[PDB]
Structure 1
Amino acid sequence: NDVKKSLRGKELQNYNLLQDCTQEVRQVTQSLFRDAIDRIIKKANSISTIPSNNGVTEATVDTMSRLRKFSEYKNGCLGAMDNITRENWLPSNYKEKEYTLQNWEDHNVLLSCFISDCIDTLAVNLERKAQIALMPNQEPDVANPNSSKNKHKQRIGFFILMNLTLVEQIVEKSELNLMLAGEGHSRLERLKKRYISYMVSDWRDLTANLMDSVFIDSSGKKSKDKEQIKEKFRKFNEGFEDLVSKTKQYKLSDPSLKVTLKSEIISLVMPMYERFYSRYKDSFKNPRKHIKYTPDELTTVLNQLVR
């Protein structure tokens, strides 16, 4: 970088060979970056089981402190981003739905582009490993909160989001912190919202067949079919306390994830029970013996679901 910049307007004739063995040291970048992605693939797929208390494989610690070894070569990284594709770190049979990525302009583009693509590779390979290790007879189907296949979307969700807890808690104080501005934050956000929505999935089942249970008996009269009262409201309480029950298995670590999953699933549930509670709270002198919660107290349950 210092020599090809040095002073120009002059004869410079080994400059070609500078670009040729520097073309081989961009095969050291290039090979070090396909090495980075394949490093994620093999070094990740080293492990086989989700941990005892289901934490974070320290191959990811290796991956992120590996990235801070990519950090402090910073200006040589900047020049080292020269004239080279996204597909120069890609196993080409991928899909771009794997990559939360939405230009070709400078090396600051390929900075956040490249590194955040590497953490997307971390996402798809960790995700794949969970998809294997919980249903060991199936196809790993990926990036799918709408999956009709997984039974562990909460569990995989808390696992992966502890891995991302690690990743942004090394981009906490990094130079990557100051490197990967703009989009890559939001790339990390979409990365989160995948597994977040995995932990909203069966809550969307509860709300789903709740308002579907509004829909199928939206035909006739007021509920003289009081099996529909205790169907919707009882089974709503059943699945609600199932979801609160399996919420207890996981105890979050980012406060903003507590705010995130909290306000997400609040915004998922509430207006259904608002118009629906308030629609059907006119059926007994004691609806108490059939319908249990207010939105006040259910809101309070959610607000101390998040200790």
Structure 2
Amino acid sequence: TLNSVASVKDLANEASKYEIILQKGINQVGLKQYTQVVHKLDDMLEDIQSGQANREENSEFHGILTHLEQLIKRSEAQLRVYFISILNSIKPFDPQINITKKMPFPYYEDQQLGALSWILDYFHGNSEGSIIQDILVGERSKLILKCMAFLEPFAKEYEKGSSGMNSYTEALLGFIANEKSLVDDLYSQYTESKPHVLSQILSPLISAYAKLFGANLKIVRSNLENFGFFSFELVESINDVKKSLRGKELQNYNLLQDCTQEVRQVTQSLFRDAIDRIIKKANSISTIPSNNGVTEATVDTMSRLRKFSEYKNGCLGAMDNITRENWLPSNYKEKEYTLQNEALNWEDHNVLLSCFISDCIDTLAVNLERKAQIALMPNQEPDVANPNSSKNKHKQRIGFFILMNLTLVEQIVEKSELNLMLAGEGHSRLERLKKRYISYMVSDWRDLTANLMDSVFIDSSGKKSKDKEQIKEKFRKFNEGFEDLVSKTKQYKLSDPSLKVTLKSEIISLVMPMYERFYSRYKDSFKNPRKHIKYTPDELTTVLNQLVR
């Protein structure tokens, strides 16, 4: 038909014909054929209105104008209904089931995607692009929401993994990826509005995720004691979401960035807190156990450090930008740590973490020592980490006290992931830590021997001494000093075989070679040595071996 030269009578007849076809509906007519009939009506309408066309203004013409307009309007409304209907063929569902059963979320069939794209193109083609886009956005939005609704409860909810945020987050990652595939399927490869459409469907989900995430981060802040290490799970959570959004345009991306900042400070505060927790715990009890054994502070410190080692991935990941000052106290005194400028890749996460554990162990030892010095010498300023401090008159007992606690620290590390996290310089700093306190236990012995040696020097300047009483006096002093030290040393029973063997060797190494030389030097100042010299070197050795074991 040539619309420009056709009578309104013939045109109207054509229209009524097209109407009968449309009345049958989309399915009977065929979707593509249906839209084509509407296009014919639309094109007819335009061909008879235009200024070019100059038809008389009578009821006949007005009647066909309204008829075409309304018929097109009703047909397009049936098209939206059809569109909405296909979108809702997929019903709300519990993603957890799909996650558990390892099944893909429901998806539209090829023919349905084809019908949806055809209708999208139809409306974009008739200047209703955004209209149909909002319908699509809207339908998808409330559908996804209803699915996530099955998890919002379990995630508002510390056993590692115990939280509905993990599966919740997993569910969200599934929808995010599925929606991207849907948009890529519905539009031409380079359709400019794809990113925009996807964003309208995902932003609400993100807004909801962000809320919940912010909620959990609140609970953690409140009951930090039992939820402290939960932040580690929240971190991988937001990291996973952000990773899934790479390249995707978003409206409220700011929410996630703020979440990444709020959860990064929390985890950062855990390490810094660990130290202060140790400092406060070590100085909480002013008294020293009478048996000089393991303390509460040590038990607590190791139990905590054992926890961190359960999130090696989180801890290591948390070492990002993280530094040693970010956890060390502002006081920070070099001599109170076993760290040695041994040039290490300080940019390595494993190195940074390792240091953290070592600093924690150093802090426990030195603070327990400070508390011990304050307890035994109330009026003195603590001089910690100094085996040579003459002012400290209790080095032996203190050394033992710290070693007994370090014995537990070592055990907890060995039987733990901590053993691996310290491999290398970690275990090395710990040995240096033990040496310092073994050195404390052996210090009084050095004084004994240094004293004996000074009295020999001062007396051996001129001719060899024949002064029996002066010589007898030198032995007497040694004997008294010896016996007093043997006596005190018996008050401390180490449990660790390794520490016992070391103490034994070091004590014998200091005393025996010097006594043998002192003895051979002066024994013959007497006709019968046995009567003026209490111990022969062999008798002295016997006494020391009994003490050791």
Q: When the two structures are superposed, what TM-score results if normalisation uses the length of structure 2?
A: 0.53
Please list every run of at least 4 consecutive aligned residues from structure 1 whose deviation after the TM superposition is greater than 6 angstroms: 4-17
Q: 1:135-158 CA distances to partner (integer Å, 9 max, x unpaired)?
A: 111211111111121221111111
Q: Which has the higher helix share?
A: 2
Q: CA 1:230–1:173 in structure 2 vs 1: closer, same or farther (change >3 Å)?
A: same
**How far off is 1:119 after superposition?**
0.7
Shift in CA distance, 268/18, structure 1 to aligned 2, threshold 3 Å: farther
Change (3 A) 1:262 1:4: farther
Q: Distance in 1 between matches of 2:350 and 2:519?
A: 52
Unaligned stretches of 5+ in structure 2?
1-238
Q: Is the 8 A contact 1:229 1:290 kept in 2?
A: no
1:54–1:159 contact (8 Å) kept in structure 2: yes
- 1:209 to partner: Cα distance: 0.7
1:216 paired residue among 458, 474, 496: 458
Measured at CA, do residues 25 and 227 of structure 1 come closer, stay the same or move farther in structure 2, by a change above 3 Å?
farther
Aligned equivalents of 2:276, 2:537: Cα separation in 1: 50
* Structure-2 change in CA distance of 1:91 and 1:284 (3 Å): same
Question: Per the alignment, do residues 217 and 73 of structure 1 end up closer, same or farther by CA in structure 2, a change over 3 Å counting?
Answer: same
Other structure's SS at 2:338 match: coil
1:41 to 279, 282, 288: 279
**1:226-261 C-alpha deviation (Å, 9 max, x unpaired):** 233222222111111111000111111101010111
CA distance in 2, matches of 1:285, 1:117: 60
TM-score by length of 1: 0.92
Task: Mark the CA change 1:72 to 1:222 in structure 2 (over 3 Å): closer, same or farther.
Answer: same
Is 1:192 the equivalent of 2:437? no
Kindly indicate whether the alpha-carbon contact (under 8 Å) linking 2:387 and 2:443 is maintained by their aligned counterparts in 1: yes
Query: Which stretch shows the higher mean deviation, 22-31 or 64-73?
Result: 22-31
Segments of 5+ residues of structure 1 without an aligned counterpart are none
Bigger relative CO (Cα 8 Å, ≥ 6 apart): 1
3-state SS of paired residue (1:178): helix
Give the stretch that moved more between structures: 63-72 or 220-229: 220-229
32 and 284 in structure 1: CA distance in 2 versus 1, 3 angstrom threshold:
same
CA shift, 1:204, in A, is 1.0
Shift of 1:294: 3.2
Q: Could you list the per-position Cα deviations for residues 199-228 of structure 1 after superposition, in whole angstroms to 9, with x for gaps in the alignment?
A: 111111110110001111111223222233
Deviation at 1:185, TM superposition (A): 1.2
Q: Tell me how far apart the structure 2 counterparts of residues 206 and 274 of structure 1 sit (CA, whole Å).
A: 15
SS of structure 2 residue aligned to 1:92 = coil
Deviation track 1:97-146 (CA, whole Å, cap 9, x = no partner) reads 10001141311101211100011110121011001111111211111111
The 3-state SS of whatever aligns with 2:241 is coil
Contact 1:157 1:199 in 2 (8 A): yes
Following the alignment from structure 1 to structure 2, what is the Cα–Cα distance between the partners of residues 13 and 177? 46
Distance 1:249 1:12, change over 3 A: farther
- When residues 79 and 231 of structure 1 are mapped into structure 2, their CA distance, relative to the original with a 3 A threshold, is same
Do the aligned partners of 2:468 and 2:526 also contact (CA within 8 Å) in 1?
Answer: no
Q: Please give the alpha-carbon distance, in whole angstroms, between the structure 2 residues aligned to 1:232 and 1:5.
A: 79
1:18 is displaced (CA, Å) by 5.7
Q: What is the percentage of aligned positions where both structures have the same residue? A: 100
Q: Does 1:282 align with 2:524?
A: yes
1:65 and 1:129 map into 2 onto residues whose CA distance is 21
- Does the Cα contact within 8 Å between 2:268 and 2:318 map onto a contact in 1? no
Aligned counterparts of 1:4 and 1:287: Cα–Cα separation in 2:
87
Query: How much does 1:50 deviate?
Result: 0.5
Change (3 A) 1:32 1:293: same
The CA RMSD over aligned residues, in Å, is: 2.3
After alignment, is 248-257 or 295-304 more displaced? 295-304
Corresponding residue to 2:540 among 288, 295, 298: 298
Range with greater deviation from structure 2 (100-109 or 21-30): 21-30
**2:402 aligns with one of 134, 139, 160:** 160
Q: How far apart, CA to CA, are the structure 1 residues paired with 2:251 and 2:485?
A: 70
Residues 237, 79 of structure 1: CA spacing in aligned structure 2 closer, same or farther, 3 A cutoff? same
Paired residues of 1:210 and 1:236 also in contact (CA < 8 A): yes
Residue 104 and residue 223 in structure 1: after superposition, are their counterparts in 2 closer, same or farther (change >3 A)? same
Q: Contact 1:112–1:179 at 8 Å: present in 2 too?
A: yes
1:15-47 per-residue CA deviation (whole Å, 9 max, x = no partner) reads: 997665334333222211111111011122111
What is the CA-CA distance between 1:5 and the residue it aligns to? 6.8
Cα distance in 2 for residues equivalent to 1:64 and 1:174:
10
The 2-side partners of 1:48 and 1:288 are apart by 49
**Displacement after TM superposition at 1:7 (Å):** 10
Asked if structure 1 preserves the Cα contact closer than 8 Å seen for 2:272 and 2:326, the reply is yes
Equivalent pair of 1:98/1:124 in contact (CA under 8 Å): yes
Which whole-Å CA distance do the structure 1 matches of 2:390 and 2:477 have between them? Answer: 21
Query: Residue 234 of structure 1 contacts residue 290 of structure 1 at CA under 8 Å; is this kept in 2?
Result: no
